[PDB]
């Protein structure tokens, strides 16, 4: 039970935590880059859209940029962030 | 259209 904390790769064990400010689950990280949990992964991890954290394994990652100031991630226009699919460990 | 893959 040792977790990655940045530069996340497929196969990494990660801690998925609730981020109230961004109203989403994210990967716990020491980097300022946000790694949001992809909404598709919530059922697999027995989470809902609360459990404060769960351990998971990264399955897929996609790099995104906010094109609108009003967005589901509550990030500024132009923010680059990741969406990560994960499964329970 | 809120975000796009880069």
Give chain A as a DSSP string: -----SS--TT-EEEEEEETTTTEEEE--SSSS-EEEPGGGTTTTT------EEEEEEEEEEEEEE-SSS-TT---TT-EEEEEEEEE-
**Cβ separation of B5 and A64 shorter than 8 Å?**
yes
User: Which approach determined this entry?
Assistant: X-ray
Q: What angle do CA A41, A43, A46 make, to 5 degrees?
A: 110
* Burial group, residue A70, by CB count within 10 angstroms (0-12, 13-18, 19+): exposed
Tell me, in Å, the resolution of the deposited structure.
1.4
**Cβ–Cβ below 8 Å for A64 and B1:** no
Strand partners, A1: none
- From chain B, pick out residues whose CB is under 8 angstroms from the CB of A80: 6
């Amino acid at each position: 039970e040792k977790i990655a904390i940045r530069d996340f790769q497929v196969g990494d064990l990660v801690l998925i935590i609730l981020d109230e400010r961004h109203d989403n689950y994210v990967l716990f990280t020491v980097s300022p880059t946000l790694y949001f949990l992809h909404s598709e992964s919530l059922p697999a991890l027995d989470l809902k859209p609360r459990r404060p954290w769960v351990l998971g394994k990264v399955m897929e990652k996609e790099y995104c940029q906010a094109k609108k100031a009003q967005n589901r991630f509550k990030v500024p226009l132009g923010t680059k962030f990741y969406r990560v699919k994960a499964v329970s460990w | 259209s809120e975000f796009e893959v880069v």
